[PDB]
DNA sequence: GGATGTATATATCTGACACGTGCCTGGAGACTAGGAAGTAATCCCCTTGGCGGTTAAAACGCGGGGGACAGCGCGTACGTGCGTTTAAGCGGTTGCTAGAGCTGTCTACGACCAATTGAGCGGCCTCGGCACCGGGATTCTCCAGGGCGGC
């Protein structure tokens, strides 16, 4: 079953990405977004923001 | 009526601005070579999120006593002040020598380049020593026969 993705999945998704360091920590001060291990990053996207 | 306080004017001292000059060091223009940026390939280490099992370290609680801290006494050693001494600080002599600066000459020593080759790095074969397996020598436990006692 292929399922369509959310608007804060897709956003996320193109923030990962395409980086966006200062877009991904906007919001709370961040906490350092690691985006070592893309892939890690875009599997935990497509399954949850 | 005489001398004192105060205001304005003039000469002199002093830091700062501009003018002048040398010179030498930085800038402009041109040329060239190589340092570094970029590209592709290969291979190994690091990242993130998990699982499993061992186990020794970490955590928690509790009793107790050793040590930190406070207080008090005391005596000594350091602060304080004064009078006396002494040597630092300044100015000075008198010559000679060391050293910075500048100029000049020259020569041995180090940069540079080409050819060469032999010392450093990797793998391969062998020995020294440690270890695995087979055989000989030495000592320990055991089963059976002979003799004696009882009904």
Same mark, same amino acid.
């Given at each position: 079953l292929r399922v369509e993705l959310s608007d804060v999945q897709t956003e996320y998704y193109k923030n990962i990405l395409t980086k966006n360091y200062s877009a991904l920590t906007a919001?709370?001060? =961040? =906490?350092?977004?690691? @985006? @070592?291990?893309i892939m890690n990053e875009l599997k935990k996207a497509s399954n949850h923001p």
């Open positions: 919001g709370a001060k =961040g =906490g350092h977004f690691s @985006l @070592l291990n």
